[PDB]
């Protein structure tokens, strides 16, 4: 729940970067493509802060299992889209 609402801003970057890859690979794929798999970077890049954040938290001692149990829900959910986002850049970069 909680989670993923998190978590559901780098998924719609995931939506809209592929959706993107397309466009551009229809559009152009001049320099799109290099600059898109840039965002996904960008993408990445907050997220990953934010996965910082929840292990900051983990360790704040202001947190109960509950909440522990949210950045465990959050790094897993984070970490796998992370992960995804690598793949996709592969994929991405792998059309170059």
Same mark, same amino acid.
């Given at each position: +729940?909680?989670?993923?609402? =998190?978590?559901?801003?780098? *998924? #719609?970057? /995931? @939506?809209?970067?592929?959706?993107? &890859?397309? !466009?551009?690979?229809?559009?152009? +794929? #001049? !320099?799109?493509?290099?600059?898109? /798999? =840039?965002? /996904?970077? &960008?993408? *990445?890049? %907050? ?8 292990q900051r938290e983990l #360790?704040?001692?202001? @947190?109960?299992?509950?909440? #522990? %149990? +949210?950045? *465990? ?5 984070? !970490?796998?889209? /992370? ?5 996709? $850049?592969? =994929? &991405? $970069?792998?059309?170059?």
């Open positions: +729940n909680t989670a993923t609402q =998190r978590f559901h801003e780098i *998924e #719609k970057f /995931l @939506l809209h970067i592929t959706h993107e &890859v397309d !466009d551009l690979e229809k559009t152009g +794929n #001049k !320099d799109e493509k290099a600059r898109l /798999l =840039r965002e /996904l970077t &960008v993408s *990445e890049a %907050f997220i990953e802060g934010s996965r910082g954040y929840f #360790k704040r001692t202001d @947190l109960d299992l509950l909440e #522990k %149990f +949210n950045f *465990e829900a959050a790094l897993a959910t984070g !970490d796998l889209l /992370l992960k995804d986002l690598k793949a996709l $850049q592969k =994929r &991405v $970069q792998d059309s170059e």
